[PDB]
Amino acid sequence: MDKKYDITAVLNEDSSMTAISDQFQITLDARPKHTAKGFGPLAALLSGLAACELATANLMAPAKMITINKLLMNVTGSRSTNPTDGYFGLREINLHWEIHSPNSETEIKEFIDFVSKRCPAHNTLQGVSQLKINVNVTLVH
Amino acid sequence: MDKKYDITAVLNEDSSMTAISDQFQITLDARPKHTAKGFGPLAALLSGLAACELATANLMAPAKMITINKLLMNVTGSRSTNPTDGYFGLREINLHWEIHSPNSETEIKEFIDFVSKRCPAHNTLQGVSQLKINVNVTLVH
């Protein structure tokens, strides 16, 4: 319980929402593409996940001896709007790693498994069960 | 499985990351307050949750006859950096609604139980169980 987080989001008029963290501000919107003003709520959560993925990898790399030249993740997910389950949440979330690294395959493999076990966000969503996280990586030498 | 999401985060130099959703861009930085460039991974993640809450509250209000004048949510959470659990994810997440509404308490109480059982984010995280989500609201007339 060492790391604490304190966030606050406000519903502005025109139904757009602005979030605040320390002195930073993000504006979110659940309205469709053709009119919004920032990330959908779920978009941001998924980006919050991606960022945790990249960050913990960048932090573990040195100890695992992986040298990274380019790192990026593409996240995709889906949920039901008219569920039978009563499960309005994410049912499937897909993480696609793209690593530009001179390190070997088996190396990159164990590395990522390590990061997945290490990123807080991943740890969190790992315990859902109504959710499925699919991971695959593209190693570019 | 009607709503799909596609996000892509990238690790820039200076260890900051930038996410992209359609034509929107948010930079996320996991460095400490003194050094940082945007939201922390989890901070945005929690914001994404917060914004889903507000967003769904705003979409359910009409059907519930709840008239909302001001709506905002303060989210706080925590995790271990040195766990014995092996769990590095969020152990607790506190949601505090502040609603300015002429509706009665019992009315806001039932409205929130509903918004809760309905925001995708909230549903997703409800399924965790190494995580405790405490909800409390401040109704302002």
Curated annotation (Swiss-Prot), chains A, B:
EC number(s) reported in the record = 1.11.1.-
Q: Taxonomic lineage per UniProt?
A: Bacteria, Bacillati, Mycoplasmatota, Mycoplasmoidales, Mycoplasmoidaceae
Its localization reads: Cytoplasm
Q: Report quaternary structure and partners.
A: Homodimer.
Classify the main location: cytoplasm
Organism for this UniProt entry? Mycoplasma pneumoniae (strain ATCC 29342 / M129 / Subtype 1)
Enzyme superclass (EC)? oxidoreductase
UniProt superkingdom: Bacteria
Entry's family note? Belongs to the OsmC/Ohr family.
List cellular component terms (GO).
Answer: cytoplasm
Cytoplasm is among the record's keywords? yes
The protein's UniProt keywords, in alphabetical order, are: Cytoplasm, Oxidoreductase, Peroxidase
Task: Note the InterPro entries from the entry.
Answer: KH_dom-like_a/b (IPR015946), OsmC/Ohr_fam (IPR003718), OsmC/Ohr_hydroprdx_reductase (IPR052924), OsmC/Ohrsf (IPR036102)
- Pfam families xrefs: OsmC
Q: What is this protein called?
A: Hydroperoxide reductase
> What GO terms are given for molecular function?
peroxidase activity
Relate the protein's function as given in its record.
Answer: Reduces organic and inorganic peroxide substrates. Protects the cell against oxidative stress.
